[PDB]
Design a protein around this ligand. Structure first.
Ligand SMILES: NC(=O)C1=CN([C@@H]2O[C@H](COP(=O)(O)OP(=O)(O)OC[C@H]3O[C@@H](n4cnc5c(N)ncnc54)[C@H](OP(=O)(O)O)[C@@H]3O)[C@@H](O)[C@H]2O)C=CC1
Ligand code: SF4
Ligand code: SF4
Ligand code: SF4
Lengths: 147, 149, 55, 314, 87, 375, 106, 315
C-alpha cells in the first residue's frame, strides 16, 4: 500500500488506456493514402486493434502523415497539428515524408515531415506495406506503454 | 423490394468467415521477389562481396546511396563508408539489379520502423549486420528466384 | 466467427435485464408482495386514502 | 553561411530547457544550426517539441539527474560550453528549495572545471542580492556566489523576469482575474518592476557566447521602462479587456492566502515564495555589465504584450 | 485530335520572354486551366485571357520554374519556428 | 475526407447552395517534370507510378510506348500480352477504387470493405511478379522486366472466375438501391459536344453517349486481337458513368479470358542489348554482355532526338506523354498529360447551382486523383 | 423531481470530472476554431435562406394542428359520435388541405 | 429507498450504451467481413471502458472563440433528457405510472434536438452552424409525422397511459393491425435518432463530424453517449408499443426476459441498416417526408379514427 505502488497502478491504467484505443486522423496526402486504407481493409483490419479513423482532430489524437508533403500544404498541416488535443502524437510514413524521399530535391517539397511537426515513430517504405505499418503502430503502443 | 434485397445481401455477408489474419501471430503471404530492408552480404568464404564499382550510386534515382572507396592494404578494392538512407530510398530495387557481384540485396525483411530519424541513415556496418542476420533467408530467396532473372 | 459476436451482445441484455427486474421486485419488497398500486384517478387514490388509516 | 544546416563550434549543455527557458535559446542556436545537448530530467513527451528545432543529428536528449555527480558528468562530457538553467519557483518536496539553487549549480561548476569546459554560464534574478523576504533570491545568491567561487570565469545572468506570452509571470497576473479582483498590497508605488523579455534575453545569451568580452562579467537584463506595478496591471487588463478590479489588502492576509494555496499536491497557482516575488521591486542599477553591452537593444514590451495575452481575451 | 477521322496533329509557335501572345481559350474551349499553368511555370503571357493566376506553386514564390535555368532546389524553404510559433 | 486530403475547393456558398466552386490545385505539386529532366530515361520511369498511383501499371505502359516510338523498337509479343494483361488488372483496380470510394463519399461505407479484399488479392499479384505490392516498376521501355513466375497464371484464373459474383453483388447493393439512384441520376449532366470542347476523356465522354474510345480507335497493342464491348452511356449523369465503370469492369474481365487463352512462349525483354540489359546468367560470363550492362546502368541508353505525344486508354481517361529526346540519355522535356486535369477544369461549369452534397458526389464522378492533377 | 435532480447532478458531475482532471496546457492557436486546417475567412454570419422559413413555418402551423389532434382518443368515447365524427375528419381534411395548397403553389 | 431504484435505473443503462458501442463495432464489423474489436478483450469486452478512459483522460479544451456557458450546458442537457426519457417505461412495471407518459416521451424527444441547436450555435465554427441548422431541419420535419402516427396508433389502445398498452396487446400484437404506421414509426425513429440513411447531423464525410466537431473529450463523450441512449430507447419504445407479450403478474421477470429480446432485436437492426444504405442528402431527406410519408400518415390517420366507429370497437 505504498503510494508508489498505487502510482504504478494508475500509471498502468491510463497509459494502458490511451494505448489501447488510439484514434488516428489521416493526411493521406499522396499515394500512401491507399496503403493506409489497406490497413483498414478487412484482411488486416486496423479496427480490431481498436484504432479507428475518425475525422476532425478534436475527436482524434495520433496522426498519420501518409504521402508526400508540399510547400503550399504545410501551413495547413501545422494548423491541424496545433488543433489536436493533448496528448497528441504523429506518425511519419513511407519514404514520403521521412525526408522528401524520392522528391528530396524539388522546390515545392518540404524535405522531412519532421521540419514542421515533432514526429513520433517512423515507418519507412515506399509505400510501406500496410503490414509494416501495422508493426509501426504496434510499436507506437509499445512506446506509449513506456510513458 | 430491392431495399430489403440489399439488406438481405449484407445479412448474407454476415455469415461468411471473416477474412482477417491474426497479425502479429500470423503474417501475410509474400513473394520471393519481394523488396524490403537492404543488406550487403558476404561470400561463403566469409569475405564481403562489395567491390565499390559504385554504380549503385549511379543508378539509384533517389541517389540515396553514397560511397567512398579506398584501397585495401592487400590492394583489393573496398568501400570505406558505404551508406544509404531509408529516408530517401524508394525501394525500387534498381540496386538489386545493378550489382555485378550481386553484393547489395534488397532483403525480405520488411519491418524496421524506428523511433529516430538518425537511425534510418544506415552505415556500412549496419548493412553488414543486416546481412549477417538474414543470410540464410536471403540466400534462400535468391536461390528461389535467380533463374527468372 | 459470427457467433463470437455473442459475448458482446449478451452483456447488453443482462444490463438491460437489470432494471426490469430491479424495479419489479423492489415494489414487492416494499409493498409486501402486494405488487404496487396504480392510482391514475382520484377515486383509486381515495381507496388508498381510506386505506393506510384503516390499517 | 549561418543556417539550419550550418555548423558552429557550440556544444551547449542546457539543463532544464523543458520550461519557459530555453526553447527560445535552443531555437536561436538552431537557426545558427549549432549543435545542442539538451538533457531531460522529466519525461520524453514534454521534450518532444524540442525535436524540430534541430537538424537531424543536432539536438541530443540525454537522461540525467542533478543529484548524482556522474549523472551530470554525463551531459558535460563533451560539451564545449555548459549553461545551467534549473529552478522551480515553488519548492518541490524531494528537491528541497535550497539544493536547487545550491548543490546543482555547484556540481555543475566543479565538473565544469574537471571536464575542462570552455565556458560555463548561470542565471540568477536581479534581486538575488540577499534580502529577508523570499528564500529564492538568497539561495540563488548562494549558488551564484558558489559557482563564482568554483567557476569564477563564468559569466552570470541577472534577468529581472523575462517577458513572454507563455511567461509564468504576465499570464499569472492576467489570470488573477479568475478569482475576481487583483490583490494589491497597497496599490500604486508599493512596488515597481521591469521585464527583459524572452527573445531579447535569448538573443542576448547566445550573443554573450558570441562575445569574447563576456567572460567572468555578471550580466544583468532589464526592461527599457520602469513601469509602476499598478499602471502595469492596468495595462494588462487594458490589453486583456477583462474587467479591472484593484484589490487593496493588508500585507499579512496575502501571505495567509499563499499558505492556503501551497497546500495543493500538484503545482499551486500561488505560493508564499511567489508572494514575496510580488511586492519587492527590482533595483535600478545599470553599471553592471548587461544587455546593451552585448550590442542588442531591448524590444519594448508595449508592442508585444498583445500577442502574449490574446488568449485571455473574451 | 479529330474524331471521325481519328487522327492527331500538332501545331506550334514561338514567343519572346516579353511579347504577350494572345490566349487561345475560345478556340479550343478547354484551355482555361493551361493558360494559368504556363503562366505560372513560365514568364509567358496570354492576351485576352480572363484570369491568369498561380497554380502548381506556393503563394509568393515568385520566379517561374521550368525556365530551363532556375535551380530545382529553388531559392527557398519553409520550416516551423517556435520562437515566432510559425512556419 | 471528401477533399481527398489535397484539395482546397473554396466556394462562395449561399444558404446551402454553392454559387461557384473554386478549385485550387497544386496542393500536392511535388514538382515532377523539373526533376525528370535531370535523370536518365530508365531512372525516370518510377515517377510515373508516383503519378496516377491508383492506376500504376498503365502509366508505365504509356511511357514505355512513348519511348519505343522514339527508339523505334518493338517488344516481343509475350511482353505485349503481359502489358495488356496487367493493363487490365489495373483497369479493374482503378474502377474498384473509383466506384467504391465514390460510394464511400456518399456514405455507403460497406461495398468498400467487400471489394478491398479483392483488391488486396490483386496486390498479391503485383506482389508476386514485381516484388512490390504496388508501384511495380515492372514495365520497361524495352518491354517488361523479369519474366513472371510459373505458378501465377492458374492463380489468376482461379480468382478471375470467381470475381464476377463479387462485382455482381456489389451491383445488387447499388444499381437498384433507389436511394443511391436518387442521389445520383440527374447530376451532373454535360453536353456531348461541350465535353469535346473541354477535352473530356474516357468515361466522361462515353457518359454523354459519344462513341469514341482509344483501344478500339487507335489500338496500340494486342487490342487488335482482343474482343470486348465498350459500354456507351446516355444521359451523361453520374449514374450512367457509374454503369460505365461497372460494365467496363466486366469487359476487362472478358479480356482476361482471352489473354489467358493466347499467351505465347518466347522472350519478354527485347533482344536489343543496346537497350535491354543482359540476363544475369549471361552478363557474368561474356564481355559485351557485361559492358552493355554497365553502360546501360551508368550512362543509360541514348535516344534519337525527337518529340512525341503518345496516349493510351488509362482507366480515368487517356494518359498522355509528350516528350522530347535531345539525343542525350537525359530526356529534355516530358510534359505529362493528366486526364484528370481537364476534368477538374470542367467541374465548375458542370456544378453550378447544385446542392453542396451533390458537388461532393460530382467530384467523385470525376473520379479524379490529385496526385495526377498536380503532376 | 427527485429523478430529475439525480440525473442533472449526475451529468454535471461528469462535466466536472471532465474538465478538472486532465490537468494540462491550453494555449492559443490550439484553442483557435477548427476550419479544416486553414484559418477561417470570417466568423459565422448570415446563412440566409427563404427556404428555411418557407417550410419551417409550415412546421409550426402543423404542430399547432396536432396539438388539436391530441384530445381525440378521449373524445372518441363521447356519448354522441356523429356530432363528433365530422370534426374528427374535418380538421384532418384541412390539415391535408393546407398541405395541398402548399403542395402546388410551389 | 426509491432513490436506489432510480440509481438502479441509471447505472445499468449507461453500461448498456457502452456495450452498445462495442456491439456496434462488432456487428457492423462482421457485415464488412472484417472482425470488429477483438485484441483487447479477449472478445473485445473490456474495450468500451478503455475507450471512455481514453476520452476523459484526454484534455478537453475550452475553445477561444466559443462562448463557454452554452458550450458546457448543452451536453448536460443531452445526457439529462436522454436518461430522463427512460423513467416512465413499463418494464413491465413502470418506474412511474404517468397517466400520459407517451406524450411525455414526445416532450423529452422534442427538447432533445434543441441541445443540438445550441451545440452548433455556441461552437461558433462554420461547419458547426451549417450542420446544426440542417440538423434541426430534418429533426423537426420528422417530429411532426412522428407525433401524428403515434397518435393514430394510440387511438385504439385506449389512452395515453403506457401500462395499458400491455393490456391491449394480450394477444394479436398491435403490429398486425397497423403495420404501415409501424413502418413510418420505424423510419421516423430512424431519422429522429439521426441514424443510418438519415445521417446528416453527424454529416460525416459531408461535413466532417457535423455539429459535434468542436467538442473535444468529455462533452463529446456526452453527446455520443446520449445519442446511443436515444437509439436504444426509441427501440425499446417501439418494442413495447408494437410488439406485445404474455404477462403473468406473478412472474414479471419472465416478461422482461422476453422484452429485452424484442427490443434488442430492433436495435441490432439499425446497425444492420447502417451497413447497408448511403445517406439521403438534405433535399430528399425532407422530400420523401413532406411529399410522401405525410399524406399516407394522414389517410391512415382518418382511417384509424374511423375504424372504431364502424367496427363498434372503441377501446
Ligand atoms: N522571467 C523569468 O522567468 C526569469 C527567470 N529567471 C531565471 O532563469 C531561469 C529560466 O527561467 P524559466 O526557464 O522560465 O524557468 P522554468 O521553470 O521554465 O525552467 C526550469 C526548467 O528546469 C527544470 N529543472 C530545473 N531543475 C530541475 C531538477 N532538479 N529536476 C527536474 N527538473 C529541473 C524544470 O523542470 P523540468 O525540466 O523537470 O520540467 C524546468 O523545465 C530560471 O531558473 C529563473 O530563475 C531570471 C529572470 C527572469
Ligand atoms: S512513398 Fe512511394 S508512394 Fe508514398 S509518396 Fe513517397 S514515393 Fe509516392
Ligand atoms: S554494385 Fe553492389 S558491390 Fe558493386 S559497387 Fe555498387 S554496391 Fe558495391
Ligand atoms: S533501393 Fe531502389 S532506390 Fe533506394 S537505392 Fe536501392 S535501388 Fe535505388
Amino acid at each position: 500500500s505504498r503510494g508508489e505502488y498505487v502510482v504504478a497502478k494508475l500509471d498502468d491504467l491510463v497509459n494502458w488506456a490511451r494505448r489501447s484505443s488510439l484514434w488516428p486522423m489521416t493526411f493521406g496526402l499522396a499515394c500512401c493514402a491507399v496503403e493506409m486504407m489497406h490497413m483498414a481493409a478487412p484482411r488486416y483490419d486496423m479496427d480490431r486493434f481498436g484504432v479507428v479513423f475518425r475525422a476532425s482532430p478534436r475527436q482524434s489524437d495520433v496522426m498519420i502523415v501518409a504521402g508526400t508533403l508540399t510547400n503550399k500544404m504545410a501551413p495547413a498541416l501545422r494548423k491541424v497539428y496545433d488543433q489536436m488535443p493533448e496528448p497528441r502524437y504523429v506518425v511519419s510514413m513511407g519514404s514520403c515524408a521521412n525526408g522528401g524521399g524520392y522528391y528530396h530535391y524539388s522546390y515545392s517539397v518540404v524535405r522531412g515531415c519532421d521540419r514542421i511537426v515533432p514526429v513520433d515513430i517512423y515507418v519507412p517504405g515506399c509505400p510501406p506495406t500496410a503490414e509494416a505499418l501495422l508493426y509501426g503502430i504496434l510499436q507506437l503502443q509499445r512506446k506509449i506503454k513506456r510513458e | 423490394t430491392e431495399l430489403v434485397r440489399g439488406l438481405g445481401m449484407t445479412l448474407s455477408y454476415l455469415f461468411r468467415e471473416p477474412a482477417t489474419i491474426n497479425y502479429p501471430f500470423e503474417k501475410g503471404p509474400l513473394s520471393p521477389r519481394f523488396r524490403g530492408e537492404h543488406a550487403l552480404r558476404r561470400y561463403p568464404s566469409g569475405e564481403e562481396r562489395c567491390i565499390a564499382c559504385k554504380l549503385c550510386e549511379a543508378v539509384c534515382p533517389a541517389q540515396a546511396i553514397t560511397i567512398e572507396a579506398e584501397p585495401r592494404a592487400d590492394g583489393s578494392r573496398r568501400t570505406t563508408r558505404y551508406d544509404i538512407d531509408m529516408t530517401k530510398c524508394i525501394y525500387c530495387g534498381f540496386c538489386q539489379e545493378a550489382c555485378p557481384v550481386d553484393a547489395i540485396v534488397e532483403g525480405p525483411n520488411f519491418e524496421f520502423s524506428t523511433e529516430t530519424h538518425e537511425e534510418l541513415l544506415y552505415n556500412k556496418e549496419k548493412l553488414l549486420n543486416n546481412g549477417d542476420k538474414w543470410e540464410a533467408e536471403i540466400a534462400a530467396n535468391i536461390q528461389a528466384d535467380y533463374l527468372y532473372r | 466467427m459470427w457467433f463470437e459476436i455473442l459475448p458482446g451482445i449478451a452483456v447488453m441484455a443482462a444490463c438491460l435485464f437489470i432494471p426490469g427486474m430491479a424495479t419489479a421486485h423492489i415494489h414487492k419488497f416494499t409493498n409486501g408482495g402486494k405488487e404496487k398500486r396504480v392510482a391514475h384517478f382520484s377515486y383509486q387514490w381515495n381507496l388508498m386514502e381510506r386505506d393506510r388509516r384503516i390499517s | 553561411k549561418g543556417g539550419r544546416s550550418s555548423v558552429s563550434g557550440i556544444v551547449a549543455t542546457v539543463f532544464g530547457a523543458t520550461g519557459f527557458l530555453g526553447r527560445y535559446v535552443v531555437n536561436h542556436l538552431g537557426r545558427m544550426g549549432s549543435q545542442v545537448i539538451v538533457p531531460y530530467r522529466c519525461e520524453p513527451y514534454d521534450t518532444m517539441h524540442l525535436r524540430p528545432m534541430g537538424d537531424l543529428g543536432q539536438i541530443i536528449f540525454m537522461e540525467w539527474n542533478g543529484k548524482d555527480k556522474d549523472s551530470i558528468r554525463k551531459v558535460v562530457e563533451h560539451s564545449n560550453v555548459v549553461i545551467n538553467l534549473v529552478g522551480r519557483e515553488w519548492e518541490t518536496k524531494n528537491f528541497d528549495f535550497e539544493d536547487v539553487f545550491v548543490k546543482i549549480p555547484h556540481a555543475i561548476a566543479q565538473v565544469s572545471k574537471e571536464a575542462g569546459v570552455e565556458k560555463l554560464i548561470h542565471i540568477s534574478h536581479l534581486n538575488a542580492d540577499i534580502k529577508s523576504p523570499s528564500r529564492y533570491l538568497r539561495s540563488k545568491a548562494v549558488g551564484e556566489k558558489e559557482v563564482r567561487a568554483a567557476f569564477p570565469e563564468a559569466t552570470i545572468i541577472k534577468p529581472s523576469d523575462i517577458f513572454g506570452r507563455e511567461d509564468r509571470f504576465l499570464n499569472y497576473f492576467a489570470s488573477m482575474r479568475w478569482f475576481g479582483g487583483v490583490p494589491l498590497i497597497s496599490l500604486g508605488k508599493e512596488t515597481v518592476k521591469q521585464p527583459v523579455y524572452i527573445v531579447d534575453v535569448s538573443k542576448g545569451i547566445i550573443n554573450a557566447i558570441k562575445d569574447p568580452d563576456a567572460k567572468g562579467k555578471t550580466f544583468a537584463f532589464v526592461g527599457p521602462n520602469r513601469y509602476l506595478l499598478f499602471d502595469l496591471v492596468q495595462y494588462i487588463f487594458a490589453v486583456a479587456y477583462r474587467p479591472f478590479l484593484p484589490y487593496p489588502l493588508p500585507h499579512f492576509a496575502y501571505r495567509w492566502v499563499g499558505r492556503l494555496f501551497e497546500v495543493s499536491p500538484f503545482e499551486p497557482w500561488t505560493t508564499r515564495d511567489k508572494v514575496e516575488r510580488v511586492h519587492m521591486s527590482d533595483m535600478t542599477l545599470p553599471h553592471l555589465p548587461g544587455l546593451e553591452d552585448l550590442g542588442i537593444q531591448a524590444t519594448p514590451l508595449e508592442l508585444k504584450a498583445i500577442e502574449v495575452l490574446r488568449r485571455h481575451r473574451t | 485530335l479529330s474524331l471521325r477521322f481519328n487522327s492527331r496533329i500538332r501545331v506550334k509557335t514561338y514567343t519572346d520572354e516579353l511579347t504577350p501572345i494572345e490566349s487561345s481559350v475560345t478556340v479550343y474551349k478547354a484551355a482555361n486551366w493551361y493558360e494559368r499553368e504556363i503562366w505560372d511555370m513560365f514568364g509567358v503571357f496570354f492576351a485576352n485571357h480572363p484570369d491568369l493566376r498561380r497554380i502548381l506553386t506556393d503563394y509568393g514564390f515568385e520566379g517561374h520554374p521550368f525556365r530551363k535555368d532556375f535551380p530545382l532546389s529553388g531559392y527557398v524553404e519553409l520550416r516551423y519556428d517556435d520562437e515566432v510559433k510559425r512556419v | 475526407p471528401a477533399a481527398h486530403g489535397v484539395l482546397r475547393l473554396v466556394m462562395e456558398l449561399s444558404g446551402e447552395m454553392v454559387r461557384k466552386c473554386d478549385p485550387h490545385i497544386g496542393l500536392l505539386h511535388r514538382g515532377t517534370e523539373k526533376l525528370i529532366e535531370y535523370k536518365t530515361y530508365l531512372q525516370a520511369l518510377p515517377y510515373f507510378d508516383r503519378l496516377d498511383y491508383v492506376s500504376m501499371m498503365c502509366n508505365e505502359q504509356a511511357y514505355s510506348l512513348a519511348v519505343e516510338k522514339l527508339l523505334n523498337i518493338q517488344p516481343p509479343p509475350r511482353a505485349q500480352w503481359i502489358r495488356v494483361l496487367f493493363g487490365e488488372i489495373t483497369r479493374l483496380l482503378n474502377h474498384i477504387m473509383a466506384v467504391t470510394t465514390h460510394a464511400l463519399d456518399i456514405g455507403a461505407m460497406t461495398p468498400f470493405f467487400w471489394m478491398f479484399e479483392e483488391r488486396e488479392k490483386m496486390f498479391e499479384f503485383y506482389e508476386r511478379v514485381s516484388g512490390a505490392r504496388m508501384h511495380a516498376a515492372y514495365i520497361r521501355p524495352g518491354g517488361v522486366h523479369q519474366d513472371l513466375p510459373l505458378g501465377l497464371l492458374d492463380d489468376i484464373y482461379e480468382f478471375s472466375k470467381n470475381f464476377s459474383f463479387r462485382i455482381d453483388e456489389l451491383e445488387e447493393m447499388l444499381t437498384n438501391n433507389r436511394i443511391w439512384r436518387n442521389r445520383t441520376v440527374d447530376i451532373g449532366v454535360v453536353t456531348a459536344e461541350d465535353a469535346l470542347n473541354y477535352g473530356f476523356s474516357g468515361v466522361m465522354l462515353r457518359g454523354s453517349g459519344i462513341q469514341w474510345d482509344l483501344r478500339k480507335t487507335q489500338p496500340y497493342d494486342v487490342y487488335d486481337q482482343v474482343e470486348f464491348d465498350v459500354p456507351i452511356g446516355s444521359r451523361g449523369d453520374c449514374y450512367d458513368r457509374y454503369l460505365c465503370r461497372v460494365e467496363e469492369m466486366r469487359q476487362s474481365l472478358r479480356i482476361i479470358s482471352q489473354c489467358l487463352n493466347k499467351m505465347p512462349p518466347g522472350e519478354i525483354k527485347v533482344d536489343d542489348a543496346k537497350v535491354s540489359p543482359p540476363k544475369r546468367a549471361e552478363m557474368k560470363t561474356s564481355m559485351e554482355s557485361l559492358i552493355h550492362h554497365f553502360k546501360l546502368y551508368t550512362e543509360g541508353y541514348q535516344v534519337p532526338p525527337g518529340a512525341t505525344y503518345t496516349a493510351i486508354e488509362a482507366p480515368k481517361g487517356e494518359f498522355g506523354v509528350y516528350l522530347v529526346s535531345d539525343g542525350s540519355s537525359r530526356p529534355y522535356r516530358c510534359k505529362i498529360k493528366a486526364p484528370g486535369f481537364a476534368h477538374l477544369a470542367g467541374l465548375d461549369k458542370m456544378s453550378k447551382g447544385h446542392m453542396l452534397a451533390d458537388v461532393v458526389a460530382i467530384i467523385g464522378t470525376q473520379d479524379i486523383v490529385f496526385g495526377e492533377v498536380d503532376r | 423531481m427527485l429523478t430529475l435532480l439525480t440525473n442533472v447532478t449526475l451529468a454535471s458531475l461528469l462535466v466536472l470530472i471532465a474538465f478538472w482532471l486532465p490537468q494540462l496546457n491550453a494555449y492559443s492557436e490550439k484553442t483557435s476554431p477548427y476550419e479544416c486546417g486553414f484559418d477561417p475567412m470570417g466568423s459565422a454570419r448570415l446563412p440566409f435562406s427563404m427556404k428555411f422559413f418557407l417550410v419551417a413555418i409550415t412546421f409550426l402551423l402543423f404542430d399547432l394542428e396536432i396539438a388539436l389532434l391530441l384530445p381525440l382518443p378521449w373524445a372518441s368515447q363521447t356519448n354522441n359520435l356523429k356530432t363528433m365524427l365530422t370534426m374528427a375528419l374535418f380538421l384532418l381534411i384541412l390539415l391535408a388541405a393546407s398541405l395541398a395548397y402548399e403542395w402546388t403553389q410551389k | 429507498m426509491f432513490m436506489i431504484n432510480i440509481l438502479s435505473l441509471i447505472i445499468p443503462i449507461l453500461l448498456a450504451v457502452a456495450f452498445l458501442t462495442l456491439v456496434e463495432r462488432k456487428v457492423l464489423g462482421y457485415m464488412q467481413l472484417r472482425k470488429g474489436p477483438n485484441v483487447v478483450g479477449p472478445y473485445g469486452l473490456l474495450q468500451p471502458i478503455a475507450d471512455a478512459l481514453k476520452l476523459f483522460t484526454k484534455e478537453p479544451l475550452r475553445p477561444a472563440t466559443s462562448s463557454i456557458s452554452m458550450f458546457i450546458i448543452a451536453p448536460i442537457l443531452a445526457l439529462s433528457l436522454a436518461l430522463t426519457m427512460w423513467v416512465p417505461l413499463p418494464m413491465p412495471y413502470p418506474l412511474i405510472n404517468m397517466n400520459l407518459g407517451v406524450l411525455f416521451m414526445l416532450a423529452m424527444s422534442s427538447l432533445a434536438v434543441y441541445s443540438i441547436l445550441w451545440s452548433g450555435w455556441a461552437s461558433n465554427s462554420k461547419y458547426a452552424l451549417i450542420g446544426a441548422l440542417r440538423a434541426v431541419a430534418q429533426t423537426i420535419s420528422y417530429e411532426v409525422t412522428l407525433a401524428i402516427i403515434l397518435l393514430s396508433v394510440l387511438l385504439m389502445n385506449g389512452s395515453y397511459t403506457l401500462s395499458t398498452l400491455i393490456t391491449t396487446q394480450e394477444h394479436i400484437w398491435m403490429i398486425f393491425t397497423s403495420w404501415p404506421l409501424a413502418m413510418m414509426w420505424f423510419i421516423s425513429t430512424l431519422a429522429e435518432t439521426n441514424r443510418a440513411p438519415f445521417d446528416l447531423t453527424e454529416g460525416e464525410s459531408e461535413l466532417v463530424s457535423g455539429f459535434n466537431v468542436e467538442y473535444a473529450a468529455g462533452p463529446f463523450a456526452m453527446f455520443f453517449m446520449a445519442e446511443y441512449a436515444n437509439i436504444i430507447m426509441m427501440n425499446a419504445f417501439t418494442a413495447i408499443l408494437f410488439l406485445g407479450a404474455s404477462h403473468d403478474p406473478h412472474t414479471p421477470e419472465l416478461y422482461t426476459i422476453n422484452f429485452v429480446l424484442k427490443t434488442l432485436a430492433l436495435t441490432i437492426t439499425f446497425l444492420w441498416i447502417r451497413a447497408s444504405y448511403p445517406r439521403f442528402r438534405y433535399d430528399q431527406l425532407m422530400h420523401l417526408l413532406w411529399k410522401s410519408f405525410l399524406p399516407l400518415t394522414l389517410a391512415l390517420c382518418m382511417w384509424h379514427i374511423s375504424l372504431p366507429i364502424m367496427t363498434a370497437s372503441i377501446p
